[PDB]
Design a protein around this ligand. Structure first.
Ligand code: HEM
Length: 184
């Protein structure tokens, strides 16, 4: 279960974050791991599409090859804090699993600038017991975490040394499908 009320970034710039571009997860911290995808690739696009606030998600497990995309319309709770009901889609946006109540994630932007970000998410998916997940994002899939975002990890009272890197998984992403999915 989740246990954190993540604090959104003071003066969070929503139009800059939600500009329709892609963010890559470079490092993550799951507060309830198992034994676990210690190996994992993830990326998202975030933008406004025809006046609606949207995110498109991509997950890939580089060992099992388990692959899935999601699209969500985000609802605002407060600045930098959202509730997202998701639908699993193929890369082209055709629905595989429809939106349903009980399938949602919260999303908090704790820190962001033009190249990097720190987010918290709490996933809810039917029957599952899932925990808090923090992710360090960058606009460049290969970028080592900078002092700006590492300071934010500290300020959130976390230790960046506990985060797991995704960079040794040689992830490759379809940026084009992530951007396109924002409209779907
Ligand atoms: C690198 C970090 C990531 C890891 C390692 C990870 C891992 C996973 C795994 C293992 C599941 C499958 C859960 C279940 O079915 O048992 C999953 C699903 C999901 N994750 Fe992540 N995730 C990460 C990042 C993200 C981010 C950044 C978000 C939100 C922005 C997110 C949103 C979701 C959603 C919505 C699902 C359910 C999708 C569906 O069933 O259609 N994940 N994640």
């Amino acid at each position: 279960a989740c246990t954190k009320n993540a604090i959104a970034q003071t003066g969070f710039n929503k139009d800059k974050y939600f500009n329709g571009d892609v963010w890559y997860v470079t490092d993550y911290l799951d507060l309830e791991p198992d034994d676990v995808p210690k190996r994992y690739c993830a990326a998202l696009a975030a933008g406004t599409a025809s006046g609606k606030l949207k995110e498109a998600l991509y997950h890939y497990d580089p060992k099992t090859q388990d692959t899935f995309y999601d699209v969500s319309e985000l609802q605002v709770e407060s600045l930098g804090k959202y509730t997202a009901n998701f639908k699993k889609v193929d890369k082209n946006g055709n629905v595989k699993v429809a939106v349903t109540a009980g399938n949602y994630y919260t999303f908090t932007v704790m820190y962001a600038d033009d190249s990097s970000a720190l987010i918290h998410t709490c996933l809810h998916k039917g029957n599952k017991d899932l925990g808090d997940l923090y992710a360090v994002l960058n606009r460049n899939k290969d970028a080592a975490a900078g002092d700006k975002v590492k300071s934010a990890v500290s300020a959130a009272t976390l230790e960046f040394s506990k985060f797991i890197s995704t960079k040794e998984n040689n992830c490759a992403y379809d940026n084009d499908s992530l951007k396109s999915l924002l409209t779907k």
